[PDB]
């Protein structure tokens, strides 16, 4: 089992970490949603699907930078909603193919009233999402750590 981002970089068998650079709406009003869809960015596959079933969860999701200070939100994992930052592990998603399949994570972040001017700086760390992978075959229990960085500034008008 292994994963990769749309702009190249990979995390190998056994887990590890990688940076993901995401384009964000340049402006979002208080009470409107900023959507960070990682299904277009993070892909995973099963290396031996004839024999093994891989199980994948969102173990933990946390906010950093401007998202931590100026936004509240939820995370959608495989169509279901959870508070973000997370306090519980999600149900699993099954990976049973060599073909790259999206990791179905999306963040829904709404600016709080207090926000104004530049809320998210370009290049800043905005989230860490931990993908946890197990299987039906042995004791493998791996973390794939995705560090999410903003490609551009996000302005929240006062």
Smallest gap from residue 22 Cβ to Ca ion (A): 22
Q: Which is nearer to Ca ion, 14 or 123 (CB)?
A: 14
Smallest gap from residue 41 Cβ to Ca ion (A): 16
SS (H, E, C) the chain: CEEEECCCCEECCCCEEEEEEECCCCECCCCCCEEEECCCCEEEECCCCCCCCEEEEEEEEEECHHHHHHEEEEEEECCEEEEECCCCCCCCEEECCCCCEECCEEEEEEECCCCCEEEECCCCEEEEEEEEEEECCCCCCEEEEEEEEECCCEEECC
98 is in an annotated binding site: yes
Closest residue by beta carbon to Ca ion = 45
Tell me: does residue 45 bind Ca ion (CB under 5 A).
Answer: yes
Q: Which is nearer to Ca ion, 2 or 36 (CB)?
A: 2
Smallest gap from residue 23 Cβ to Ca ion (A): 24
Rounded distance, CA 43 to CA 66, Å? 26
140 is in an annotated binding site: no
Q: Which is nearer to Ca ion, 2 or 130 (CB)?
A: 2
Rounded distance, CA 18 to CA 28, Å? 27
Tell me: does residue 4 bind Ca ion (CB under 5 A).
Answer: no
- Total residues binding Ca ion (CB under 5 A): 1
Q: Which is nearer to Ca ion, 69 or 97 (CB)?
A: 97
Binding to Ca ion (CB under 5 A) within 84-123 occurs at: none
Residues belonging to the binding site for Ca(2+) are 98, 100
- Contacting positions for Ca ion (CB under 5 A): 45
């Amino acid at each position: 089992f292994a994963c990769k981002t749309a702009n190249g970089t990979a995390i190998p068998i056994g887990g590890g970490s990688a940076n993901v650079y995401v384009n964000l709406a340049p402006a979002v009003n208080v009470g409107q949603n900023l959507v960070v869809d990682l299904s277009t960015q993070i892909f995973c596959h099963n290396d031996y699907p004839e024999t093994i079933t891989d199980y994948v969860t969102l173990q933990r999701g946390s906010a950093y930078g401007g998202v931590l200070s100026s936004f509240s939100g939820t995370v959608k994992y495989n169509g279901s909603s959870y508070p973000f930052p997370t306090t519980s592990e999600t149900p699993r998603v099954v990976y049973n193919s060599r073909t790259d399949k999206p990791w179905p994570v999306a963040l829904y972040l709404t600016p709080v009233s207090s926000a104004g001017g530049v809320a998210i700086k370009a290049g800043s760390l905005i989230a860490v999402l931990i993908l946890r992978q197990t299987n039906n075959y042995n004791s493998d229990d791996f973390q794939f750590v995705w560090n999410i960085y903003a490609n551009n500034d996000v302005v929240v008008p006062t």
